Amino acid sequence: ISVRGLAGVENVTELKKNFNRHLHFTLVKDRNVATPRDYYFALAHTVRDHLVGRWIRTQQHYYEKDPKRIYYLSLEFYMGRTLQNTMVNLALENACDEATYQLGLDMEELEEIEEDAGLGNGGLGRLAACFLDSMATLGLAAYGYGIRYEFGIFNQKICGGWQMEEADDWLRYGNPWEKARPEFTLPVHFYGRVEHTSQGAKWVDTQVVLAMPYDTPVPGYRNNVVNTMRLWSAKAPNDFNLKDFNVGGYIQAVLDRNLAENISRVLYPNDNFFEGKELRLKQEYFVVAATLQDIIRRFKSSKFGCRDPVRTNFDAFPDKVAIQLNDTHPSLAIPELMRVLVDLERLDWDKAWEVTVKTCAYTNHTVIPEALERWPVHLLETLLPRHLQIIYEINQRFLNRVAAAFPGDVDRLRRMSLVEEGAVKRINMAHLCIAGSHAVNGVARIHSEILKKTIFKDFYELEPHKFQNKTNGITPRRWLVLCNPGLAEIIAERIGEEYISDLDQLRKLLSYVDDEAFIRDVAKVKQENKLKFAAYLEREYKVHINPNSLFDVQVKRIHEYKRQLLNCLHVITLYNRIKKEPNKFVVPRTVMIGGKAAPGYHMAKMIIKLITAIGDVVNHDPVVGDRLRVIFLENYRVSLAEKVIPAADLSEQISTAGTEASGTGNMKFMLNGALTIGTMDGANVEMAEEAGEENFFIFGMRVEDVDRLDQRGYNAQEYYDRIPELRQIIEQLSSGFFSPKQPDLFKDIVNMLMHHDRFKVFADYEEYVKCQERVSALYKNPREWTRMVIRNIATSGKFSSDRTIAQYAREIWGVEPSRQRLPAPDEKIP
Amino acid sequence: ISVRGLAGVENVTELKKNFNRHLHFTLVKDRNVATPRDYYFALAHTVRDHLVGRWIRTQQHYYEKDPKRIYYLSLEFYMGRTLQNTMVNLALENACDEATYQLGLDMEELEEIEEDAGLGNGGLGRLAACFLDSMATLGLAAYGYGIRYEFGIFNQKICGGWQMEEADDWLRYGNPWEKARPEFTLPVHFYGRVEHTSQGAKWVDTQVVLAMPYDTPVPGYRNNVVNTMRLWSAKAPNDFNLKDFNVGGYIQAVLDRNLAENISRVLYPNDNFFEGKELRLKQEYFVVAATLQDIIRRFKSSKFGCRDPVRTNFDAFPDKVAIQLNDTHPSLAIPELMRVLVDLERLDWDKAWEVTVKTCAYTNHTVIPEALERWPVHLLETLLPRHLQIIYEINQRFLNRVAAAFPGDVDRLRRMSLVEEGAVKRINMAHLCIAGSHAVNGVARIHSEILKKTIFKDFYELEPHKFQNKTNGITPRRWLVLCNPGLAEIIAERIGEEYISDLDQLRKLLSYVDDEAFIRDVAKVKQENKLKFAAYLEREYKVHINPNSLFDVQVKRIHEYKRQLLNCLHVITLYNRIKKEPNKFVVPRTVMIGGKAAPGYHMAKMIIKLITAIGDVVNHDPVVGDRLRVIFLENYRVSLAEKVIPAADLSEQISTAGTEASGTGNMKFMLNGALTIGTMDGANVEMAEEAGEENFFIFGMRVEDVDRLDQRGYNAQEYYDRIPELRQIIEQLSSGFFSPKQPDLFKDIVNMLMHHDRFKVFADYEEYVKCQERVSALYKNPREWTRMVIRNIATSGKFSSDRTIAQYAREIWGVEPSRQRLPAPDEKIP
Ligand SMILES: COC(=O)N[C@]1(C(N)=O)O[C@H](CO)[C@@H](O)[C@H](O)[C@H]1O
Ligand SMILES: COC(=O)N[C@]1(C(N)=O)O[C@H](CO)[C@@H](O)[C@H](O)[C@H]1O
Ligand SMILES: *Cc1c(COP(=O)(O)O)cnc(C)c1O
Ligand SMILES: *Cc1c(COP(=O)(O)O)cnc(C)c1O
């Protein structure tokens, strides 16, 4: 059937009876009233049963051996569905497929019922998910720590061409994967004041919110390692949240509990944008405060909570603990670790600081200013008074270091301060992270260089040793074996299965680049993939596409820097050329644009309306026929990505040079047989460098050109004046060609494009459509297109998250990865 | 060990492996980190497994055979713990006791970990729970329908002698008994307006709240019948509760969902008191609206949703459906049933009314005015506009009936109206229920007569056939076999086990009233019970009592009509007499008073403070010694009742004649070997009548005397003037003898007692202490005390809820009870 494992005789039988056990005893249903949803849960529970045994021994193991622990703090974990992934990592896929088949059910139909764990916005959240999978696969004693939002990223609905947001009640029917652990609930404090008494400061008169943990298993790839993702939930104490007496109402007091519990109710839907709301700051301290207590508790036991030197010496803390900050969201971990060590454990400042810096590491994910976290001091002042005092003290000592290093450099001092003066004083969280971490890294080579040359230049000059790079990656399990079994099979037919946990081995595919059968096969799976997606489209969304055309897709969050608008200009151009010479042949294309717009991002929502507007015109023009279709992919999410990427021919990664830190969708497309048209931005550079620029469609300004233009001054009118095709499009938008009933509908877009385009869309227009012509040319030659595809796939190995994690492990965490199978799952009951 | 069933070889082994399965697979723990709480859950899950099989076949059965269905609508279901009860009804107790013993655990210790399902206030809620158990035991196709509050009755804490309320987070660790059924979620409407168009009215522009059901199994006693208790939970729709667009905030919109979901957040803690809050009214319509849809859906399928006459003829609705209204809380079921039949199904008014009256029955539980539900019209007008119109129309037609029956009786018309004029117009829910039901019943013989003679006199004259009586009862399973296995065993040793489901058989115990061994045994279990309670006291609450003294207990909600104050006067009297003649012998007593005070009931909270105040003095007087102890039983609830009642010697049921509708605690004490001192009120009359007044300690005014006094006019000064002992107590309270630091602390109590005692405490004082002297006399003669006890126990049979339910069944529902074992639980998987 494929190498989804063995469909053993004893195990298919075993699976079937357990499926029935759960349907009866767990779901309390009988075959006569069971629905596909019930069948999905019975299966989910049956599958979950197989990893609890391994989950328990893995955790017990780490307790016995006591290795260094890695704590990945992130406010986002974009997990997606987990049924299939679990089957794949446990080699259960074929057996489950067989068993359910014998039970008369279609596993694929049941898999579609599982709700996505959308506790993420985009790249940053999904990176965290891929990392978890890789850390498990590499045998690291790692823990994912976050917030259990009851409402993840909103579900997007298109109404009249506009985006409509609606609550993502992903827990509505329950989550069979998580395990509530109310017995490990911890208290978290807010507000209050600071008392300075005799021997130390005291955080007093605080409001208490409880943090209840929920553990979700994270299985490594076929190695019997099952790590843990711990998500905190906010709960109100039953005392003060009722007991602070003297009139108000008993009923009201109980109803008001949903004020402390609002902390974990919803994820902020912002991608690369900072919103300084109090609720957000609360979420940030909540995950940090709860997590740290858990970390220290584990440390106090270790082998120190037995003997060792005997005296809670936190000197070995950094040797046993490593906490990675996914961006600045969990940045409060630094002053919080200090607070606990100094205020509670009573360590001297300097010893505490040494420990803190040695256990913390910070990862930066963007350079755009509006995404940078700068919290107003009056907010920190009210909500976390002691942390503000600690931050000021950290700032004081850090600046003294600078002054001593750069005597008399008074501007450098203000530039480097953690405190920003002006309208309102703010705290620069990024500056805090650099000061309190022993390592700072970018997510792509160019992005990392930009940090050193630009944004964090002064910090780099001060401590050059802190700055590193760790190019992002993706997990070959979910992003290849899971979503594209067809491609994984044919690769396996030639080079084996060892590449799934050793993606570099894909290079061996280079020697089949002239293999006639392989070329035919690679081309076949892609055709099968396109057919299945074209079908899904009519199934779930309804209104035909042509599977023979070039599948041109751009899927990612809607942003001005991502330039979906530039994609728009090209689409309209294609349209206008066809209308000019109708009876001239052109390579057919289905251009699919999908992504979510943050609810408050007006421009982004205007772009979504533009895309649908273009489709309204283009898709109903008889002269165009089936040569050009414009489709907006609704509710783009992980589960939808697993469907479109394997069916894509052309991947669009056209952000303005220097704005996309890395990107990961680009890597997803490369490993799945799509060719990339893009700019020398983020990881695109390393991808082209790995496949060879001849096998990539690069165009546009490089970073240098962008800066040259800025020195000069960007004037969009120039481009409008010298390019008639561009001029024609702008006047079409301006006159209502794409919006008849509301002719001025797109005035904001035009206005922006002509007067305040921060991402110089026009500057890359000419080189973009010219480059697009080159891909159309190559698509006309199936054999050569496929051979170039093979060159990309065979060369994507470097982009696996296993590589990324191995580097973090060795160069930052100080731990050694291991592909050693944990000693079976085998029963056991001590 | 006892007749807690057989500890079979095959089943103890089977139990143990399933206990281990759950501890591993369900709880995801290993013996080395498992806590008593984990052990309790493993067991709970193991036990629950045994009734799912029966649960499924019971429900399937009713679907096949299609008998008349009984729907018990109540806003309260005071369930308590359910582990032991389930073991008892499935004959699993000894086997579980053995198995857990072999696993090295103490079952009793694990049982104490289960949280109480406190979804009730007192009598009314517990009655509903006992009824459910009896309906299951009598094989009735019955369904309990209510609200799943996430916070039940508050947990009471005594601080400085005052009651402190704190949220009852009973779901904190989960509920292994319930089964969420999200797939059966239903919509419920609120607000909106009424449109009158061509062919009918339309309820329009309403706000939608979703009702999600949670099913809990209700097992009959050893007959393999497992009925269902369906509890609704409020959930916000994800559309409008987000989709009603045009600025407000996406985050805020999501946070605001906890506005629609507040409907099922907390139970109103009022016992016999009406609070006209909007939230309450919402709860009342919510349970009614959701339940009715479920009822009609089931009816539409039946055997009509196949064939029958073919034409949704609701003429057979009353032949297939019976809905019992537990008080007026679910009274909206009447106009709601009309709304659906008339507005949606399109039946003519008269045919609809006939159906409604024929399927609905109302049970009244109190005659005190402040407990009567009278909803302001402006509230119904805003929240349920169509229901108000329907009510007015029902009123119009009803009054026309009256006018026609009593021509010219204009005062009768206003008196009987469902609408009450005055300050604000109100709707008398009780009048509504009588008009729309074919049966109205009281809960005790005297209470039922009082309804006919007083409160509902006019209604009785109009339709004498509607009024009946159904004396309350209690379940012998929980209230005897479960809480007092020792007593159940010795009874079983003489007369067998058939009495558990046929309590009348207890009469056979009359022939052992002179049996020397029996008297010794009955006396022994009570001594063992007192010793165990005296121990629990020091274990969980701490500060000694004497097990040889007379256990004088009064446990029920704190109310002015219950007269805990009269009990107080007696206690102080005993104290004063001892202080007067220290070296005179008196029968030692431990008087225990426990109960909860509604948060807004100032007087009730003042009485709790008085009780503790008396104990502060009495319990620390050296001259008193161990002859008199005053203890306030904290957090009185079902699980606590199962502990005190079996250990009680004297039961206090001293409410003012005519105020306690029935009472059920009194029955609990009688069947558990306690003697009753009380007034001729509620069911006390029938109890004394059943045991013989010689075996009861009756005192005080009868109803007639109360009324005589009211004609005359009650003057408490008279009593104060003629009784020096009474005078001495009042002056002690007034001067601060019981409250030194705050001498005027009890001025409200004294003031009330002397000037506004609605329950004439003083009028029954003299006859009360005189009667108390008689019980002390009899306690001095152990042999005769025990023989009188045997006379009560042997004669309590009539007070089993099986008797009560059999009468409801035959005289109101029109169904026949059956003690037929359902065809085993045996596997099966169709
Ligand atoms: C806070 O900045 C970010 O979130 N940055 C992003 C992203 N928005 O997902 O992170 C991911 C993961 O590193 C990068 O691939 C992407 O280029 C970058 O923009
Ligand atoms: C609404 O009135 C009531 O709730 N009445 C009560 C009770 N408060 O529990 O109901 C129970 C059950 O019928 C009666 O035994 C008790 O005397 C009566 O007061
Ligand atoms: C991989 C992924 C992303 C990141 O896309 P980029 O193109 O790097 O912005 C965002 N959303 C989903 C659902 C993803 O799978
Ligand atoms: C039986 C019961 C009641 C009713 O007591 P009465 O004396 O009838 O008021 C109230 N509370 C609990 C916990 C009960 O078990």
Tab-separated table of N, CA, C and O and ligand atoms in Angstrom, chain A residues 78 121-124 126 271 474 479 555-557 561-562 636-639 641 645 652-653 660 662-666 668-669, ligand 3:
chain	number	residue	atom	x	y	z
A	78	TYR	N	1.489	26.243	16.643
A	78	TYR	CA	0.580	25.940	15.537
A	78	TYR	C	0.622	24.453	15.182
A	78	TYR	O	1.202	24.079	14.166
A	121	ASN	N	-0.391	31.858	14.715
A	121	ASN	CA	-0.773	32.814	13.668
A	121	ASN	C	-0.202	32.437	12.320
A	121	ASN	O	-0.889	32.477	11.313
A	122	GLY	N	1.073	32.082	12.311
A	122	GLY	CA	1.715	31.714	11.070
A	122	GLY	C	3.053	31.043	11.263
A	122	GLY	O	3.140	30.012	11.925
A	123	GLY	N	4.090	31.655	10.695
A	123	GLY	CA	5.440	31.114	10.746
A	123	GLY	C	6.027	30.791	12.098
A	123	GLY	O	6.487	29.675	12.339
A	124	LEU	N	6.023	31.785	12.979
A	124	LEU	CA	6.550	31.629	14.327
A	124	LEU	C	5.870	30.469	15.080
A	124	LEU	O	6.538	29.660	15.727
A	126	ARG	N	4.175	27.818	13.788
A	126	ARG	CA	4.435	26.550	13.110
A	126	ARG	C	5.881	26.129	13.323
A	126	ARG	O	6.170	24.933	13.369
A	271	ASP	N	0.052	38.901	13.203
A	271	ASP	CA	1.247	38.280	12.646
A	271	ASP	C	2.208	39.437	12.380
A	271	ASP	O	1.863	40.381	11.676
A	474	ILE	N	11.908	22.747	8.411
A	474	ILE	CA	10.573	22.200	8.554
A	474	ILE	C	10.726	20.691	8.779
A	474	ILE	O	11.763	20.109	8.448
A	479	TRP	N	5.527	17.528	6.722
A	479	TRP	CA	5.628	18.187	5.431
A	479	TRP	C	6.105	17.386	4.206
A	479	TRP	O	6.448	17.958	3.173
A	555	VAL	N	0.434	31.248	-0.610
A	555	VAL	CA	-0.320	31.086	0.629
A	555	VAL	C	0.533	31.409	1.854
A	555	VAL	O	1.556	30.780	2.112
A	556	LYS	N	0.097	32.422	2.596
A	556	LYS	CA	0.758	32.892	3.814
A	556	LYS	C	-0.127	34.018	4.359
A	556	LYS	O	-1.081	34.436	3.700
A	557	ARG	N	0.171	34.516	5.553
A	557	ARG	CA	-0.648	35.592	6.096
A	557	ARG	C	-0.605	36.791	5.152
A	557	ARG	O	0.396	37.025	4.475
A	561	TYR	N	4.258	43.644	3.325
A	561	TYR	CA	5.616	43.227	3.001
A	561	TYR	C	5.667	41.915	2.204
A	561	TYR	O	6.608	41.672	1.446
A	562	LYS	N	4.647	41.076	2.354
A	562	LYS	CA	4.612	39.812	1.626
A	562	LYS	C	4.291	40.082	0.155
A	562	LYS	O	4.545	39.240	-0.706
A	636	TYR	N	-7.082	29.595	5.155
A	636	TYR	CA	-5.781	28.947	5.036
A	636	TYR	C	-5.283	28.621	6.430
A	636	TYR	O	-5.221	29.499	7.289
A	637	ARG	N	-4.927	27.358	6.648
A	637	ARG	CA	-4.429	26.896	7.942
A	637	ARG	C	-3.547	25.683	7.688
A	637	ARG	O	-3.437	25.235	6.550
A	638	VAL	N	-2.934	25.141	8.737
A	638	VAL	CA	-2.055	23.976	8.582
A	638	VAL	C	-2.687	22.838	7.767
A	638	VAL	O	-2.116	22.389	6.775
A	639	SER	N	-3.871	22.389	8.161
A	639	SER	CA	-4.529	21.299	7.443
A	639	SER	C	-4.797	21.626	5.975
A	639	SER	O	-4.809	20.730	5.134
A	641	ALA	N	-2.853	23.723	4.255
A	641	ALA	CA	-1.522	23.777	3.668
A	641	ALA	C	-1.089	22.369	3.251
A	641	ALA	O	-0.456	22.189	2.211
A	645	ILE	N	0.063	22.656	-0.924
A	645	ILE	CA	1.485	22.584	-1.223
A	645	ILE	C	1.871	21.390	-2.095
A	645	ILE	O	2.594	21.544	-3.072
A	652	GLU	N	5.151	31.129	-4.682
A	652	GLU	CA	5.410	32.567	-4.676
A	652	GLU	C	5.979	33.077	-3.358
A	652	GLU	O	5.269	33.097	-2.356
A	653	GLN	N	7.250	33.485	-3.378
A	653	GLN	CA	7.954	34.006	-2.201
A	653	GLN	C	8.576	35.333	-2.626
A	653	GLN	O	9.792	35.484	-2.710
A	660	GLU	N	11.372	39.632	4.951
A	660	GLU	CA	10.943	38.312	5.423
A	660	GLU	C	12.153	37.675	6.094
A	660	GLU	O	13.078	37.256	5.423
A	662	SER	N	12.914	34.828	7.349
A	662	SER	CA	13.305	33.535	6.803
A	662	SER	C	12.232	32.976	5.892
A	662	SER	O	12.431	32.832	4.683
A	663	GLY	N	11.081	32.684	6.484
A	663	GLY	CA	10.007	32.065	5.742
A	663	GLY	C	10.214	30.571	5.914
A	663	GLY	O	11.333	30.113	6.168
A	664	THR	N	9.137	29.801	5.816
A	664	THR	CA	9.228	28.345	5.948
A	664	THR	C	8.301	27.676	4.947
A	664	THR	O	8.469	26.504	4.604
A	665	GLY	N	7.317	28.437	4.475
A	665	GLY	CA	6.383	27.928	3.489
A	665	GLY	C	7.180	27.637	2.236
A	665	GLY	O	6.918	26.661	1.521
A	666	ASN	N	8.164	28.498	1.972
A	666	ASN	CA	9.036	28.353	0.810
A	666	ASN	C	9.713	26.980	0.835
A	666	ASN	O	9.799	26.308	-0.192
A	668	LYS	N	8.561	24.383	2.430
A	668	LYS	CA	7.527	23.375	2.264
A	668	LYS	C	7.301	23.038	0.788
A	668	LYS	O	7.228	21.861	0.417
A	669	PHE	N	7.209	24.079	-0.044
A	669	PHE	CA	7.002	23.933	-1.491
A	669	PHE	C	8.172	23.254	-2.212
A	669	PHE	O	7.961	22.437	-3.114
C	3	LIG	C1	4.317	27.140	7.034
C	3	LIG	C2	3.065	27.979	7.417
C	3	LIG	C3	3.118	29.399	7.513
C	3	LIG	C4	4.377	30.236	7.135
C	3	LIG	O1	4.326	30.709	5.770
C	3	LIG	P1	5.393	31.700	5.196
C	3	LIG	O2	5.220	31.622	3.757
C	3	LIG	O3	6.747	31.496	5.796
C	3	LIG	O4	4.813	33.088	5.721
C	3	LIG	C5	1.969	30.114	7.728
C	3	LIG	N1	0.769	29.486	7.809
C	3	LIG	C6	0.692	28.132	7.713
C	3	LIG	C7	-0.680	27.536	7.890
C	3	LIG	C8	1.845	27.355	7.523
C	3	LIG	O5	1.773	25.988	7.329
